[PDB]
């Protein structure tokens, strides 16, 4: 049902165990695959029949392995056949196939070497964002105030499409700093850390621009946000149906 | 019942036509002429200025003949044009 | 409900043939009675869906040449085979059962190219399904060039081996009754069109004045083969034609109708006019539709011809007015399956039907009247039969009708036309014998 | 005279039927993209594979609304 792709060189699968076990709790069946030590390619389709309802991509430095496993064409075919997708790409761990696939969806994440900085922050160690910047109550709205740990994260630019669902944007005083001389990628409210996308066939994709959001360390601050975010991206939370017109 | 009917069908003579189809065109072309002659005569009788009690008699007999002929020739001509009755 | 276990199966050999567009099954069964009471009946097991899709069902002795009484009964369903003379409480019987179903395997890749080969997926029970326990069994698959399994099971015994154009399965040696649990899914290669007539309206017109029998058939044909991926490209079809690829393709380009011997005046039309691509050869009528029939396309058309009445109608020996007609039930393409057949026979105006019978069971029969070109009176007697699942060359029987047609009814038709004309003439006379002058 | 470089491709319609002598040609309007990309850009994506796809730079898009 669910296929989890994990690169061991970037971040180990063990680190993100907290939320994965909860999938077994909700009756999800799962299959694992590591691209660092794989030989044969995954088979997403079997004679016009896809074998996975969901796909989870963990932080990975793009290379020959990711391109071999899931090219952009295969990803678009899977997404068009009612497959759900979860993507993660932090500064220093942003692939190229994922970036191109998101560029085909109207989502432009910052490249490698660009990081978010916010000086007017209650946190000097890491990046933290309060629940004030939540942008859609149908995905997650906290009953009481909270804050989420992000650390070294990225931002994305969005187009004016009906299918794009902004979830969490960057703070107003934030900005993109590049190691090089690149013009700042984002600035203020026009940068987004958690974005969603709904197909016209009602498939769903969620992209998080941080590798720290689902780590076992931040289990106390991000447990619920992440839980019902995973509930939304898998057509389990906010699906509607019309009857007897 | 199937058995008995099968045995009957397979132990009988074939169908013999009354008049063969190949002959019917000639019969139709001849009967049409006869019908035309008789009917056209009875129309002459209608135009006749003679009594009524005799015009009725002649017309009725002539029509009773022309109609028999015309029906027979209608059957033959229809069969000969490819529209079987 | 289960039939009592009065019998036991010594040996069971099931061979499935997939060569045609329908599934054919032959069972070699050896049975011995296990109770002391003599029983003349044997029961055959069929699943609900298979039961609905059964077309033909027969059985006989492996030694005799005649058939026993084998009738379907109307959630495993049952067919009953009746024995002519009862059996000893402990004696051997050697039966051979044959069946033809209206089902066929669906294309495994639903969309293939214009020149690619086709494969079909067919799902049937693997161990013998029966209500009488069996102590020996075997399964064979014939008719295709390659056989593979879809999601095979771990157990080695529940697997098969290949021969030449064959696929034998496990020779198991003890099966309980009602053991239809494991289901087998086979994938085979069939590169021909799968023709399916969704509706046939066959009309036979008999005429004693012309001595002719006229056949008019209205087909509603479909192709159940793989659909064309990428859509139809006339350029690719022409490049296949001129390449001289006469390979067996899974789309219909030309149909071959097998007619009764001595037919004349053939014609081939459809709902939009007359089709000019048709050619008659001895006993055969070749037909080319307006467009090739690819997987998933429909085509509704009409064929017709004429024959001599003296080949189907005979006269009774007791009187020259009782006639017996024997009319064929199907005259169509070689390898085709039918889903609904309405067979209508038209007898002349004054005919009174006396006896009817069909060689295969029908779903309905009815008698009414219908007016025609010169039917001033009630009209032609229409006798209609309704059949469901029929197969091209296994339903080769003939319907038998015995009717009466006196000479009075023969001569009454020109008489009716004559009365009409005479009435018109009397009307003209009346209109020309009264003055309307002022 | 017509050359295979004269006729540009169709990105919004699909040929469904051509008669035997090419007299009548029937096309079908294709359904729009689920993602919302233009059918022109899906067509270009299919007709183009380049190793150096493009530069890093940035989109000139307007303000998100
Ligand atoms: C007032 C007097 C006027 C004098 C002039 C008369 C006729 C004009 C001359 C020649 C025309 C004949 C050529 C047409 C026949 C071939 C076309 C065809 O074959 O078409 C027919 C249509 O049947 C028709 O309508 C033709 C009518 C036949 C007319 C014969 C003329 C003699 C009778 C004249 C009327 C007398 C009045 C009597 C009133 C009580 C196709 O039928 P179908 O497709 O249904 O096939 C049927 C096959 N099943 C049954 C198996 C489905
Ligand atoms: C040609 O024949 C086909 C086959 O019977 C007809 O298809 C059916 O059409 C009715 C009405 O549109 C549908 O309810 C059925 O589901 C169709 N059956 C199949 C198997 O497709 C078709 O309508 C006929 N066309 C004409 C013009 O008569
Ligand atoms: C067998 O006869 C006819 C088949 O034509 C069916 O019954 C008739 O069906 C027509 C079709 O609409 C109706 O108008 C009639 O009212 C029906 N009844 C009669 C008595 O004609 C049906 O398939 C069968 N009838 C039976 C078994 O009684
Ligand atoms: C693949 O193996 C480990 C798995 O964690 C990874 O750290 C390493 O960089 C990769 N390469 C080799 C040679 O081990």
Domain boundaries, chain B: 1-85
- For ligand 3, atom 3, name the residue with the nearest CA: C366
Question: Quick check: C26 and C150 in contact, CB under 8 A?
Answer: no
CB atoms within 10 A of CB D42: 17
Using an 8 Å CB-CB cutoff, list residues of chain C that contact chain B. Answer: 205, 207-212, 214, 265, 309-311, 313-317, 323-324, 326, 355, 357, 359, 372-374, 400, 402, 410, 413-419, 421-422, 425-426, 428-429, 432-433
Question: Quick check: C315 and B12 in contact, CB under 8 A?
Answer: yes
Question: Quick check: D39 and D32 in contact, CB under 8 A?
Answer: yes
Report helix, strand or coil for C350: coil
Pocket test for ligand 3, best of C340, C364, C383 (most atoms within 8 A of CB): C364
- For ligand 4, atom 1, name the residue with the nearest CA: A36
* Angstrom distance (rounded) from CA A9 to CA A59: 10
Question: What count of residues does chain B have?
Answer: 85
In sequence order, the β-bridge partners of residue C93 are: C31
Nearest-atom index, ligand 4, CA of A12: 5
Report helix, strand or coil for C270: strand
Q: Which residues contact C427 (CB under 8 A, 6 or more apart)?
A: none
C109 to chain A nearest CA, in Å? 6
By C-alpha distance, which of C337, C334, C329 is closest to C362?
A: C329
By C-alpha distance, which of C198, C201, C218 is closest to C345?
A: C201
A21 to chain D nearest CA, in Å? 32
* Angstrom distance (rounded) from CA C107 to CA C120: 4
* Angstrom distance (rounded) from CA C139 to CA C145: 17
Q: Which residues contact A133 (CB under 8 A, 6 or more apart)?
A: A168, A169, A170, A171
* Angstrom distance (rounded) from CA C97 to CA C56: 11
Give the distance (Å) from ligand 1 centre to CA of residue C74: 49
Question: Quick check: A153 and A210 in contact, CB under 8 A?
Answer: yes
**Secondary structure E strands in chain A:** 2-6, 30-34, 54-57, 84-88, 107-109, 114-117, 128-130, 147-149, 156-158, 164-169, 175-178, 192-198, 204-208
* Angstrom distance (rounded) from CA C151 to CA C292: 35
Of A104, A111, A166, the CB nearest to D35: A104
DSSP letters, C324-343, are EEEEES----SS-EES-EEE
CB atoms within 10 A of CB A207: 26
Report helix, strand or coil for C288: coil
* Angstrom distance (rounded) from CA A128 to CA A121: 7
Residue contact D34–A199, C-beta within 8 A: yes
Report helix, strand or coil for C299: strand
Give the distance (Å) from ligand 3 centre to CA of residue A8: 74
Please name the residue that has the structure tokens 């299959």.
Answer: A31
Instruction: State the pairing for strand pair C138-142/C7-17.
Output: parallel
Q: Is B74 in the pocket of ligand 1 (CB under 6 A)?
A: yes
Alpha-carbon separation of residue C305 from B8, C258, C264, C329 (angstroms): 28, 12, 6, 15
**Segments making up each domain of chain A, as ranges:** 1-239
Question: Quick check: A3 and A35 in contact, CB under 8 A?
Answer: no
Report helix, strand or coil for C377: coil
Resolution value (Å, 1 decimal): 2.8
Q: Which residues contact C133 (CB under 8 A, 6 or more apart)?
A: C5, C8, C9, C175, C176, C177
Residue contact C232–D19, C-beta within 8 A: no
Q: Which two tokens stand for residue B57?
A: 């008699």
Packing angle between helix A97-104 and helix A72-80, nearest 10 degrees?
A: 50
* Angstrom distance (rounded) from CA C221 to CA C200: 9
* Angstrom distance (rounded) from CA B29 to CA B21: 14
In sequence order, the β-bridge partners of residue C26 are: C15, C98
- φ/ψ of residue D2, rounded to 5: -115, 135
* Angstrom distance (rounded) from CA C10 to CA C29: 8
Of C310, C400, C419, the CB nearest to B14: C310
Q: Which two tokens stand for residue A56?
A: 């989870």
- For ligand 2, atom 17, name the residue with the nearest CA: C198
Please name the residue that has the structure tokens 């006396």.
Answer: C354
Question: Quick check: A209 and A193 in contact, CB under 8 A?
Answer: yes
Question: Quick check: A83 and A197 in contact, CB under 8 A?
Answer: no
Alpha-carbon separation of residue B11 from A221, B14, C320, C323, C398 (angstroms): 99, 10, 15, 12, 16
Q: Which two tokens stand for residue C168?
A: 């034998």
Q: Which two tokens stand for residue C256?
A: 């071959």
Q: Give the closest ligand to the alpha carbon of residue C301.
A: 2
Q: Which residues contact A149 (CB under 8 A, 6 or more apart)?
A: A123, A126, A127, A128, A212, A213, A217, A218, A221, A222
Q: What is the DSSP secondary structure assignment for residue C127, as one 8-state letter?
A: S
């Amino acid at each position: 049902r669910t296929l989890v792709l994990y690169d061991q060189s970037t971040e180990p699968l063990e680190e993100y165990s907290v939320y994965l076990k909860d999938l077994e709790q909700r009756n999800y069946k799962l299959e694992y695959l590591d691209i660092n030590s794989t030989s044969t390619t995954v088979d997403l389709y079997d004679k016009e029949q896809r074998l996975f309802d969901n796909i989870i991509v963990f932080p990975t430095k793009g290379g020959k392995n990711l391109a071999r496993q899931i090219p952009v064409k295969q990803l678009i075919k899977f997404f068009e056949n009612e497959g759900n997708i979860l993507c993660m790409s932090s500064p220093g761990a942003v692939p190229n196939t994922i970036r191109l696939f998101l560029n085909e969806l109207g989502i432009y994440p910052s490249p490698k070497g660009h990081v978010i900085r916010d000086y007017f922050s209650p946190s000097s160690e890491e990046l933290v964002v309060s629940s004030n910047h939540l942008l859609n109550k149908y995905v997650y709205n906290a009953r009481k105030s909270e804050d989420f740990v992000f650390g070294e994260s990225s931002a994305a630019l969005l187009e004016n499409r009906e299918q794009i669902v902004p979830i969490l944007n960057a703070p107003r005083t934030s900005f993109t700093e590049s190691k090089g001389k690149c013009n700042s990628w984002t600035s203020g409210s026009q940068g987004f850390l958690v974005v969603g996308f709904q197909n016209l066939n009602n498939a769903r994709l969620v992209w998080i621009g941080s590798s720290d959001f689902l780590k076992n360390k931040n289990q106390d601050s991000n447990q619920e946000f992440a839980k019902e975010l995973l509930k939304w991206t898998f057509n389990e939370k906010s699906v509607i149906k019309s009857v007897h017109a | 019942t199937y058995e008995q009917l099968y045995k009957e069908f397979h132990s009988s003579k074939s169908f013999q036509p009354f008049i063969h189809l190949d002959t019917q065109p000639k019969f139709a072309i001849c009967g049409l002429i006869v019908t035309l002659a008789v009917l056209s005569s009875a129309l002459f009788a209608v135009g006749s200025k003679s009594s009524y009690i005799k015009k009725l008699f002649f017309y009725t007999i002539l029509s009773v003949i022309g109609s028999l002929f015309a029906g027979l020739t209608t059957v033959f001509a229809s069969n000969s044009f490819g529209v079987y009755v | 409900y289960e039939p009592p276990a009065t019998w036991e199966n010594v040996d069971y050999k099931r061979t499935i043939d997939v060569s045609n567009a329908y599934i054919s099954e032959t069972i070699e069964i050896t049975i011995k009675n296990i109770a002391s009471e003599p029983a003349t009946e044997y029961f055959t097991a069929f699943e609900s869906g298979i039961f609905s899709k059964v077309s033909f069902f027969s059985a006989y002795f492996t030694n005799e040449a005649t058939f026993l009484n084998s009738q379907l009964l109307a959630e495993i369903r049952y067919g009953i085979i009746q024995f002519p003379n009862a059996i000893s409480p402990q004696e051997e019987v050697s039966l051979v059962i044959k069946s033809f179903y209206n089902t066929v395997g669906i294309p495994y890749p639903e969309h293939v190219g214009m020149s690619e080969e086709q494969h079909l997926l067919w799902e049937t029970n693997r161990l013998p399904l029966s209500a009488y326990d069996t102590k020996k069994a075997s399964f064979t698959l014939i008719g295709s060039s390659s056989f593979e399994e879809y999601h095979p099971p771990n157990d080695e015994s529940l697997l098969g081996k290949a021969n030449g154009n064959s696929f034998e399965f496990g020779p198991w040696e003890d099966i309980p009754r009602f053991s239809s649990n494991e289901t087998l899914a086979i994938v085979y290669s069939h590169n021909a069109p799968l023709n399916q007539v969704v509706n046939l309206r066959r009309d036979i017109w008999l005429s004693h004045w012309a001595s002719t029998i006229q056949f008019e058939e209205y087909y509603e044909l479909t192709n159940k083969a793989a659909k064309l991926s990428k859509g139809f490209s006339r350029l690719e079809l022409m490049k296949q034609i001129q390449t001289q690829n006469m390979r067996q393709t899974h789309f219909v380009t030309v149909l071959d109708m097998l007619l009764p011997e001595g037919a004349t005046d053939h014609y081939f039309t459809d709902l939009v006019g007359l089709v000019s691509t048709s050619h008659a050869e001895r006993d055969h009528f070749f037909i080319r539709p307006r467009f090739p029939i690819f997987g998933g396309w429909n085509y509704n058309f009409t064929v017709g011809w004429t024959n001599k009445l003296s080949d189907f109608l005979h006269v009774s020996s007791g009187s020259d007015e009782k006639f017996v007609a024997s009319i064929p039930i199907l005259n169509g393409p070689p390898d085709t399956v039918y889903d609904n057949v309405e067979l209508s026979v038209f007898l002349p105006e004054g005919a009174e039907i006396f006896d009817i019978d069909s060689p295969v069971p029908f779903t309905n029969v009815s008698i009414e009247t219908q007016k025609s070109y010169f039917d001033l009176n009630k009209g032609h007697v229409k006798l209609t039969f309704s059949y469901r699942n029929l197969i091209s060359q296994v339903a080769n029987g003939q319907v038998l009708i015995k009717y009466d047609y006196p000479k009075s009814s023969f001569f009454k038709k020109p008489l009716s036309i004559a009365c009409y004309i005479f009435t018109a003439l009397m009307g003209v006379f009346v209109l020309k014998t009264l003055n309307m002058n002022v | 005279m017509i050359t295979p470089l004269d006729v540009p491709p169709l990105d919004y319609f699909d040929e469904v039927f051509t008669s035997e002598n090419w007299m009548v040609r029937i096309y079908q309007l294709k359904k729009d993209d689920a993602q919302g990309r233009t059918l022109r850009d899906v067509g270009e994506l299919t007709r183009s594979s380049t190793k150096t796809r493009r530069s890093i730079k940035r989109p000139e898009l307007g303000l998100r609304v």
